[PDB]
Amino acid sequence: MNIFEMLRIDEGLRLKIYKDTEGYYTIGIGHLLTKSPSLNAAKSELDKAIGRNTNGVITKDEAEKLFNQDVDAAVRGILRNAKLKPVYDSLDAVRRAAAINMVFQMGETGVAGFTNSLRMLQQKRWDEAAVNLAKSRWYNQTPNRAKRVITTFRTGTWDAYK
Ligand SMILES: [Cl-]
Ligand SMILES: [Cl-]
């Protein structure tokens, strides 16, 4: 198991524009297109992202390409962030995948606001961090996915994904 297979399980794959859990125009493997209500603003962003007139539909390869870019960008955002970097560096390889997952889903600002959990993770207080992470809108909105990520932080194994 690795970050790619992990996110592929959490996000699914959709080849036609769809609305995410928050109601936003998304495509592929969790690629947010726009927070605007306009399907046209979404279609525009889509064509811009792919480099072609897509009419709202992409191929698997195109999906995977967006996905490759997004994971990369997620990692780089963590590495560039003064609050996230130290925590991330402190983690083992499995837990690092959990961190990437959160950033991919909620953005760097979002995660960055989990100050207390971040401190707990850095100190390696696993059960404590797990409890604190659950006290969040994130957990309340996407409980099954949150639980999976949280279990990964708690255990340091891929059990939630097996
Ligand atoms: Cl893009
Ligand atoms: Cl969920």
Q: Which ligand is nearest to the CA of 11?
A: 2
Q: Which ligand is nearest to the CA of 67?
A: 1
- What determination technique applies here? X-ray
Q: Where are the alpha helices (DSSP H) in 85-125?
A: 85-90, 93-112, 115-122
Nearest to 3 by CA among 34, 29, 26: 29
CA gap 104, 160 in Å, rounded: 18
Active site residue 11: yes
Resolution in angstroms comes to: 1.7
Active site residue 62: no
* Candidates 20, 47, 64, 128; catalytic one: 20
3-state DSSP assignment of residue 80: helix
Q: How many Å lie between the centroid of ligand 2 and the Cα of residue 143? A: 5
CA gap 94, 97 in Å, rounded: 5
Cβ atoms 156, 94 nearer than 8 A: yes
CA gap 131, 115 in Å, rounded: 14
Query: CA of 126: how far to CAs of 16, 37, 55, 117, 158, in Å?
Result: 39, 39, 46, 10, 15
Residues with a beta carbon under 5 angstroms from ion ligand 2: 142, 144-145
- The domains of the chain are located at 1-162
Q: How many Å lie between the centroid of ligand 1 and the Cα of residue 90? A: 30
CATH of domain 1-162: 1.10.530.40
Backbone phi, psi, residue 124, to 5°: 65, 35
Q: How many Å lie between the centroid of ligand 1 and the Cα of residue 49? A: 5
For residue 160, how far is the Cα from the chain centroid? 16
